[PDB]
């Protein structure tokens, strides 16, 4: 068991932040700190005002270091909202006293872990997110794991994946602080939020295997997630986007759903939104789960449509049926507009695949994909036009299973 070396476990428990490691650290909460009453029972901090949130963790000075020798690991879930690539410097989790200990900060697109021996000697390691893949900010939940061996390496992991490895050379030992401070403090030289859950410290150096077991065990992998990593829900407006076409939003021409190039990457708030509706599932609690049967509603010009197949003006390709927006009764939705969802998460995104349902059952008929095709929609008459459309590949779609063009994301409209 890896829990044997766990010396701190900061968790929200019955609307109270506490250490559940058995080592009974003092947890003091000040200012504007919000606790989530539902999963993942996170706590929320801001950079706003003089009365911003502050969580002080004071560890028992003795008992926690009996098992520690040369190595320690820090793990936690974190989400930062409007993590812009030009973000000013912030210290977010501080554990430095008298120029000794460790600190976690954010600057630009970097999450930086600093290890301080004294005022003259320190080393840092970092994760820098891919700006091109996150033009609207890195605003999703991610899992951080930092391992340190004083006679070996500092290592940083994001979502179970090893990001960087730096040899500890300068430092020859650390006098750790009693205190860990969760607070958003601007470095002395627009407003940001931070969510944390399950902050753990281990008295050993966790390996790749341990980190992944940990990473997965803190998740409900059967629950589909939205773009930011929160639980995907029914009866909620989302912007539906294809992973391969992030600069595209949803529009309508005639029967067809068409994809247009978005204005900018300030946010995702452009074009029409979908609402996910449940038909079938094992649990009934508003959350979208793997193997659920569902359909999609959308409001366009004071009318509500459902997504469904339609016959295109001319053939698009073998086994290809276009998906459009139709004003149809439930019988037609079940026959031609029902989908089976299956989550597929990667390091880069929280996404899902959608399979065409056979009469609103869990039997599969095709996979929902995307492509550009030349045909006629709306009032097109004289000429065929190229349209980027959602398309279902029916019967034969084995080579599309591993294709990212079948990965769909949902950004909350809010």
């Amino acid at each position: 068991s890896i829990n044997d070396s766990k010396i701190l476990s900061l968790q929200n428990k019955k609307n109270t932040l506490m250490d559940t490691s058995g080592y009974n650290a003092e947890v003091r909460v000040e200012g504007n700190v919000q606790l989530n009453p539902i999963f993942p029972f996170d706590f929320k901090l801001g950079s706003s005002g003089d009365d911003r949130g502050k969580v002080i963790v004071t560890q028992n000075e003795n008992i926690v270091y009996n098992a520690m020798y040369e190595s320690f690991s820090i793990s936690f879930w974190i989400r930062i909202n409007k993590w812009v690539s030009n973000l000013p410097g912030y210290t977010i989790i501080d554990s430095v006293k008298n120029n000794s200990g460790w600190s976690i900060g954010i600057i630009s697109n970097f999450l930086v872990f600093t290890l301080k021996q004294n005022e003259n000697s320190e080393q840092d390691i970092n994760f820098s997110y891919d700006i091109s893949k996150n033009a609207a900010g890195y605003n999703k939940w991610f899992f951080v794991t930092i391992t340190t061996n004083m006679m070996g390496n500092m290592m940083i992991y994001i979502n179970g994946k090893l990001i960087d490895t730096i040899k500890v050379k300068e430092l020859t030992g650390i006098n750790f602080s009693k205190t860990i401070t969760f607070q958003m403090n601007k470095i002395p030289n627009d407003n940001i939020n931070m969510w944390i859950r399950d902050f753990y410290i281990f008295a050993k150096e966790l390996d790749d295997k341990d980190i992944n077991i940990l990473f997965n065990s803190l998740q409900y992998t059967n629950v589909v997630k939205d773009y930011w990593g929160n639980d995907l829900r029914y009866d909620k407006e989302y912007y539906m986007i294809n992973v391969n076409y992030m600069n595209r939003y949803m529009s309508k021409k005639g029967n067809g759903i068409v994809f247009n190039t978005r204005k900018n990457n300030n946010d995702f708030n452009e074009g029409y939104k979908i609402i996910i509706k449940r038909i079938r599932g094992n649990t009934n609690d508003t959350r979208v789960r793997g193997e659920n049967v569902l359909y999609f509603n959308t409001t366009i010009d004071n009318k509500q449509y459902s997504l469904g197949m339609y016959k295109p003006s001319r053939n698009l390709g073998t086994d290809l049926v276009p998906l459009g927006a139709l004003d149809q009764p439930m019988d037609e939705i079940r026959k031609y507009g029902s989908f089976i969802i299956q989550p597929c998460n990667t390091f880069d995104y929280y996404a899902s695949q959608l399979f065409l349902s056979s009469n609103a059952t869990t039997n599969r008929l095709g996979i929902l994909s995307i492509g550009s095709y030349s045909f006629k929609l709306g009032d097109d008459y004289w000429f065929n036009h190229e349209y980027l459309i959602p398309v279902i590949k029916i019967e034969h779609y084995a080579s599309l299973l591993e294709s990212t063009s079948t990965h769909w994301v949902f950004v909350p409209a809010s």
Partner: peptide
């Protein structure tokens, strides 16, 4: 059957 559902989809959504 599945073969029936594919035949139905071909008849309804393909030209022709």
């Amino acid at each position: 059957s599945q073969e029936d559902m594919f035949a139905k989809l071909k008849d309804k959504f393909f030209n022709e």
